[PDB]
């Protein structure tokens with residue numbers, strides 16, 4: 397189906413943009429680059445795993461990995477007077493007493509490729525800027541979910557969608573060529589503006605075309621196109637290690653889509669009072685609005701939360717991610733079936749409870765049981781996927797046609813606000829205690845579970 401394919405491609409191409417940070421911006425293990433260590437290593441013959449025993453701050457209670465990652469012994473490594481057995485025994489009565497400094501001269505990264513982290517040195521004190529990368533995108537989303545309606549009111553639909561697709565394709569391509577963090581964040585923001593606009597527009601068009609009976613099914617099929625997008629993201633990120641190659645390979649298809657769309661007649665897609673206060677005027681409607689806002693926020697937070705957490709902590713990222721993407725499909729069938737069989741409130745509650753429990757269990761798990769961790773992670777991802785499917789319908793059902801679209805605009809803006817807050821909770825906060833983010837996700841999931849039961 398051409399008329400179906402041309403929109404599902406525009407859904408599948410959105411997933412590499414939203415989640416791509418997990419592959420464009422991994423943080424590999426690193427230590428302070430150390431001038432003269434290469435010379436002393438050449439003299440003494442230290443192998444890669446051996447040099448880190450003698451040339452980096454040692455681990456201890458409470459890890460001390462921060463010292464290894466962000467400090468270095470200020471030793472005169474050029475000295476041939478140093479012992480090749482262990483130079484630090486020649487220099488101090490105890491290693492603890494050596495002079496220590498910051499990595500003034502550079503960084504060494506254990507990867508054959510590169511990521512934005514490795515390429516702009518977003519390590520140690522700079523590491524917040526990495527969360528600033530995903531935050532700028534979700535800020536683009538927030539400005540999109542509100543400004544796109546006004547724009548499309550003031551600018552013609554065909555012109556609007558042509559513009560936003562061209563700008564998405566270009567800005568995504570140009571991001572690969574950004575030479576500095578400022579320009580990269582600006583392209584990330586422009587793409588944040590236009591990507592959600594395109595995604596919502598394509599969704600609207602596909603649901604406007606398909607008959608009202610099949611429309612509901614086609615919505616879930618359009619979601620599953622996102623999962624196929626995640627699978628493609630994994631494949632490309634495995635074939636193309638350097639983040640620029642990946643960014644081009646991700647962006648190009650949306651460019652070629654315009655070279656296709658212009659070459660053949662596709663005009664029907666574009667050719668074919670509400671007030672914010674009225675969403676709150678009455679206490680029951682107001683309460684339901686608050687609940688839907690909360691649940692959209694919670695599921696956004698948990699979805700990006702689990703994906704970024706996995707990106708930050710998984711030991712076999714590519715298969716830990718592949719086996720997680722391919723779980724949304726069974727999740728989609730479980731959703732569609734259960735929606736038809738017994739409704740939507742009980743599934744949305746149970747699936748949020750399942751997500752909360754899965755997050756909580758990941759606190760207690762012994763992490764060497766990688767096979768258990770990946771299973772619980774999959775159970776969580778399935779849960780939050782089913783909940784997102786359910787709430788996409790429930791947010792239509794609980795608002796009347798007089799305000800339904802404004803309710804969607806609100807809820808989506810709440811999702812984008814959660815997308816803005818989630819990164820700093822996942823990374824910039826995780827350095828306090830690795831349980832913390834999972835405690836938050838557990839609490840959020842359990843509350844979303846309990847709160848859900850109040851909806852009619």
Ligand SMILES: CN(C)C(=N)NC(=N)N
Pocket residue numbers: 414622696699700784811815
């Ligand atoms: C993570 N976000 C906000 C998405 N674009 N995807 C989704 N289906 N919610």
